[PDB]
Symmetry: C2
Subunit: 65 residues, 2 copies
C-alpha cells in the first residue's frame, strides 16, 4: 500500500495510540504477550491485555523515537 496518505497516516496514529484511553501514546509492553497497546496511565488498571487476552505478568516502559 499504495493507499491514500491520510488513510496510511490514520493507521499509524491508531497503532501508536493507547487502546483504552484513545488519547496518550502507547508506552508499556506487556509481559509475556509483548503487546504495546496502552499508555503508562492506563496499564495499572488492566489485569489482561486488550488485544489478545493474556494476563499481564510484567511490564516494560518503552519510548518511541
Amino acid at each position: 500500500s499504495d493507499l491514500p496518505v491520510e488513510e496510511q497516516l490514520r493507521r499509524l496514529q491508531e497503532e501508536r495510540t493507547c487502546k483504552v484511553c484513545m488519547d496518550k501514546e502507547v508506552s508499556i509492553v506487556f509481559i509475556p504477550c509483548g503487546h504495546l497497546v496502552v499508555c503508562k496511565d492506563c496499564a495499572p488498571s488492566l489485569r489482561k491485555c486488550p488485544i489478545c487476552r493474556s494476563t499481564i505478568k510484567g511490564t516494560v516502559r518503552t519510548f518511541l523515537s
Copy 2:
C-alpha cells in the same frame, strides 16, 4: 500539528522503522534504556542503543497492534 499529512505520515513511518536497517519495523525494546528503535534481525548485532548509547543489558520482543 497541524502539519501536512504526508509530513505527519513520514514522521510516524520513521519512528516505526528500524534505525539500523531502515527496512523492517521496530520490535525490540532495550533494557534498561527502554528504546524501541531496532528490529529483531538487527538487535543481536548491537552492544549499545543507537539513540542514547546505553549498553543493552536485556531485550523484550514487542508487537505493534
